Every structure is written in structure tokens, then in C-alpha cells.
Amino acid sequence: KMQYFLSTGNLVSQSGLDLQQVSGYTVVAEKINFYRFISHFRMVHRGSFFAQLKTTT
DNA sequence: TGGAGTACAAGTGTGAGGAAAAGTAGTTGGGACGAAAGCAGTTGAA
């Protein structure tokens, strides 16, 4: 079940964590060059809830 | 100066033992990209 989280990114939880989305939690570490690869690890994301908003604040 | 009993061995049927590497007997491990807008016929009660 932990592999299913890491294979899809879908968060199945009977509680619901304190988080506001249920998907996209894991990405593919690409190796097309090293700059692509090292910058997956310095990358941070605001949340997928904010990708659907029309406000640019 | 003949017979009555008799242990030592030559000699004859019954089954019972011996073994192994093939198979099979019960437990445990393990298999399984969507929280969009002004708007309209029906439809709320006045």
C-alpha cells in the first residue's frame, strides 16, 4: 500500500491528513541531464489546490 | 550273547527377515490533474 502511494501519488486515507489535495504527491525523477535531476530535490510546490484559482496573489 | 531304550548328526519343509531410493504424509511460508458563467423554461407562493 505504500508502494501504491509512491507509484501513483494518489493519497488514500480514511482520516484525511491535514492536506488539501489527494493527488500529485509524487513525481518521476527524470534523468534527461543532471540539471533536471538535481533540481527535483530543490523544488517546492505551493499546492495543487492553488493551480485552479484565477487570483495571481 | 540277542534286545530295550536313545543322543548325535545326516537330512527335509515352513516364512521372516534385510535393505534402499523412490514416492507421499502435515505444518509453515507465501501469491495478488476538475469546489466553471449568466440564464431559461418550469415553478415557488402571493
Determine if strand B comes within 7 Å of the CB of A48. Answer: yes
Determine if strand B comes within 7 Å of the CB of A20. Answer: yes
N- to C-terminal Cα distance for chain A? Answer: 37
Determine if strand B comes within 7 Å of the CB of A10. Answer: no
User: In angstroms, what is the resolution?
Assistant: 2.7
Looking at residue A50, what DSSP letter applies?
Answer: G
Q: How was this structure determined?
A: cryo-EM
Q: Cα–Cα–Cα angle for A46, A1, A44, nearest 5°?
A: 15
The nucleotide minimizing the C1' distance to residue A10's CA is B33
Q: Are A40 and A30 in contact (CB under 8 A)?
A: yes
Determine if strand B comes within 7 Å of the CB of A27. Answer: no
Closest CA to A21 of A57, A55, A53, A43: A53
Q: Are A24 and A6 in contact (CB under 8 A)?
A: no
